[PDB]
Structures are given as structure tokens and as C-alpha cells.
Amino acid sequence: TIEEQAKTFLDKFNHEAEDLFYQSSLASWNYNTNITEENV
Ligand SMILES: *[C@@H]1O[C@H](CO)[C@@H](O[C@@H]2O[C@H](CO)[C@@H](O)[C@H](O)[C@H]2NC(C)=O)[C@H](O)[C@H]1NC(C)=O
């Protein structure tokens, strides 16, 4: 094993978490830099 299959779950958690947090953070950077209601 249950620990060896728990390393498998967090290995594929960490791949899609990094690419998808980057889009959530870059879109928030563009709003705080450039106030438009298009960017809300
Ligand atoms: C701030 O955000 C607006 C979007 O609301 C940007 O306006 C775009 O500007 C590009 C040119 O750089 C145009 O091709 C787009 O059509 C524009 N979009 C809209 C909805 O007008 C604006 O450029 C941003 N400011 C900066 C400095 O990047």
C-alpha cells in the first residue's frame, strides 16, 4: 504494497499539479499587473 502504490499516486499527482498551478498563478499575475475586467 500500500505504501508502494501510494508513491505511485503522488508521482502522477505532482506532474499535473505543477502545470495546472502555473496557469492559475500566471493568470493571477496578469490581473494584478494589468487591471481589466477581461482579466477578472
Ligand atoms: C492588458 O490587458 C488587455 C486585455 O484586456 C490587453 O489588450 C490586448 O492587447 C493586445 C495587444 O498587445 C491585443 O492584440 C488584444 O486584442 C487586446 N485585448 C483586448 C481584450 O483588448 C493589453 O495589451 C494588456 N496590457 C499589457 C501591457 O499587456
Q: What is the resolution of this structure in A?
A: 2.9
Answer yes or no: are the C-beta atoms of 31 and 39 closer than 8 Å. yes
Residue 30 makes CB contacts below 8 A (sequence gap 6+) with 39
Here the cell at position 31 is 490581473
Please give the angle made by the CA atoms of 11, 16 and 18, to the nearest 5 degrees: 95
CA 23 to chain centre: 6
Residue 27 makes CB contacts below 8 A (sequence gap 6+) with 39
Q: Is there an atom of ligand 1 within 6 Å of 37 CB?
A: no
Q: Is there an atom of ligand 1 within 6 Å of 32 CB?
A: no
Q: How many CA atoms lie within 13 A of 8 on its CB side?
A: 5
Q: How many residues does the chain have?
A: 40
The residue behind cell 508521482 is 11
Q: Strand, coil or helix: what is 40?
A: coil
Here the cell at position 18 is 505543477
Experimental technique of record: cryo-EM
Ligand 1 centroid–CA 23 distance in Å is 18
